[PDB]
Design a binder for this molecule. Sequence first.
Ligand code: OV6
Ligand code: OV6
Lengths: 133, 133
Amino acid sequence: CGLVASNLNLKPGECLRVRGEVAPDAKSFVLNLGKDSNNLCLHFNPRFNAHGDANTIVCNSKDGGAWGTEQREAVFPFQPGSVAEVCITFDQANLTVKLPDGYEFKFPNRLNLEAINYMAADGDFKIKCVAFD
Amino acid sequence: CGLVASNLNLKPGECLRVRGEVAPDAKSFVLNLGKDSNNLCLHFNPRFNAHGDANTIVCNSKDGGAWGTEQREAVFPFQPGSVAEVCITFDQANLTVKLPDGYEFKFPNRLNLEAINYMAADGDFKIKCVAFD
Ligand SMILES: CCCO[C@@H]1O[C@H](CO)[C@@H](O[C@@H]2O[C@H](CO)[C@H](O)[C@H](OCc3cn(C)nn3)[C@H]2O)[C@H](O)[C@H]1NC(C)=O
Ligand SMILES: CCCO[C@@H]1O[C@H](CO)[C@@H](O[C@@H]2O[C@H](CO)[C@H](O)[C@H](OCc3cn(C)nn3)[C@H]2O)[C@H](O)[C@H]1NC(C)=O
């Protein structure tokens, strides 16, 4: 329902910087990354109040259409109705997700992707800027 | 084939900014904007040395798969081996294309689109940032 991008050609060590607006009534937003819509290295899902979670980031993978096992993070530097920037890089072992206010976490590269070509936003997150370092 | 973005929901008067690196041996690049690959309100094609043309911007539309009447511009503010920003807006009458070196031109809006939802880049231009005002 938000921006979808393909042919991103993001390679290991490169930095994808995504800035957007968190809706003021936000309950949840999503940023998906991977090979395509059925093969996600990162389903990144901050939940303000949704699917049974309060102020928790849920992450998952999707492999040939099948969801993996969710991982729940320990930090949440997002507020409804504000701008947020997320920066992502990956290597053979992990994606590294950098968040506002100095937070960051790692999520295993379960699909062993060597390139990230697909991104999609959904939920209460309006992308304003995508930049490639 | 370069970055493709959909669901852009660019409304009249909003600005789309694209910054990229022009290859040192560039021949031609394309930014396509519209609804989808068959419906382009703007095919923007700087030709450094391509199709018999030298340092000429070629523009066209595509409606239901059919190319419109091509137009050429009179200024070529691009250099191989350098970074360039392009900035595009639209209303019902025209698209306005703002380029480096202060140059700006209008191209008639020959489709009826409520919003620009699709953008594809191709050719000798590596996209470094995209912004939606
Ligand atoms: C009844 C629930 C109690 O159990 C829950 O069962 C839901 C449905 O399986 C899980 O939620 C699902 O988790 C998936 C990623 O793993 C995706 O996030 C799905 O959203 C897809 C989406 C949203 N957007 C905006 N775009 N795509 C989301 O519905 C949810 O974690 C889990 N909650 C828990 C265990 O506490
Ligand atoms: C005007 C009618 C007859 O004269 C020539 O007929 C070619 C093919 O009809 C035109 O070339 C075509 O112009 C189009 C935009 O009008 C697009 O740019 C096409 O490329 C689309 C594309 C392919 N790819 C891989 N990426 N982009 C390009 O092939 C060429 O300008 C044209 N005019 C001149 C003076 O030369």
